[PDB]
């Protein structure tokens, strides 16, 4: 929701879905959607430049090649 | 954010909200916003109403908040079982009975009075009206 003392996330630019986890767990991890899958567009979010720019000028495994985290 | 500076106990019972109200007649200002309904006013609500009210008028006028939350309402964290003790204080509310004058105001023409009080009552979960100070 917040990063620095100045920039923050209004949650109106951050969609989350509840999907299933992996690995062990029994008949629970099968049905129950307990893992979180978070998507966050940067190109079209209320973030400053030098944040949008600095993300899109990076190579992190969380950042998709389409400017979405 | 109104709050009891150094209360006595942290958590208190839910209780009830039966009866009519006591802060009923306009005491301080020329006019006021009586509560026709019944319920609770979170500190966030009182703050938003006071801001929506003190901005509709400029720094002109004077406003009295005849309500103060002084009741800690607790909620359990998300995804917990029942039991294991009472929750944790998360906000403070003032129980409002029909008749409690929530905001008094003076120093502005009744035009600004009614307008600001409508702008404020838009931010409250409880029916309100507009009352004038009465005599005898």
């Amino acid at each position: 929701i917040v990063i620095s003392r100045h920039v923050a996330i209004p949650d109106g630019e951050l969609e989350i879905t509840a999907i299933r986890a992996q690995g062990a767990g029994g008949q629970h991890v099968n049905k129950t959607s307990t893992a979180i899958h978070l998507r966050f567009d940067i190109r079209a979010s209320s973030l400053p430049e030098y944040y949008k720019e600095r993300l899109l000028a990076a190579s992190h495994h969380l950042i998709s090649s389409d400017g979405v985290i | 954010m109104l709050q009891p500076k150094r209360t006595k106990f942290r958590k208190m019972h839910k209780g009830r909200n039966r009866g009519l109200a006591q802060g009923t007649d306009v005491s301080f200002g020329s006019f006021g916003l009586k509560a026709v309904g019944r319920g609770r006013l979170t500190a966030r609500q009182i703050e938003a109403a006071r801001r929506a009210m003190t901005r509709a008028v400029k720094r002109q006028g004077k406003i009295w908040i005849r309500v103060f939350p002084d009741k800690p309402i607790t909620e359990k964290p998300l995804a917990v079982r029942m039991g294991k003790g009472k929750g944790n204080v998360e906000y403070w509310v003032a129980l409002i009975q029909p008749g409690k004058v929530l905001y008094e105001m003076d120093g502005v023409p009744e035009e600004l009075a009614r307008e600001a009080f409508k702008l404020a009552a838009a931010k409250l979960p409880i029916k309100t009206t507009f009352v004038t100070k009465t005599v005898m």
Binding site: - | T24, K34, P98, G99, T134, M136
Partner: protein
């Protein structure tokens, strides 16, 4: 000098007074002095109009009961909590 008609409260108490206030009247009590205070029922719309004037309480009033006329000053009034209504008034004789 506001003239106010009236009637003696036939039966008194909470239930009767609530029936009264539902009948578009309301009670009031004239006391002050040595005579027994007079329990009065009296119309609501007239009186709620009268009290709207800033003179209703500063001046004197002529309560009419069985032809009798009483000069009184409204000492104390029980208003409704949130409705523009009156529940009761203390009319002090003289």
């Amino acid at each position: 000098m506001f003239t106010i008609n009236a009637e003696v409260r036939k039966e008194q108490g909470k239930g009767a007074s609530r029936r009264l206030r539902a009948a578009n009247k309301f009670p009031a009590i004239i006391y002050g002095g040595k005579e027994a205070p007079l329990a009065i029922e009296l119309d609501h719309d007239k009186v709620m109009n009268m009290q709207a004037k800033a003179e209703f309480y500063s001046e004197v009033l002529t309560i009419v009961v069985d032809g009798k006329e009483i000069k009184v000053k409204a000492q104390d009034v029980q208003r409704h909590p949130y409705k523009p209504k009156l529940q009761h008034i203390d009319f002090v004789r003289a």
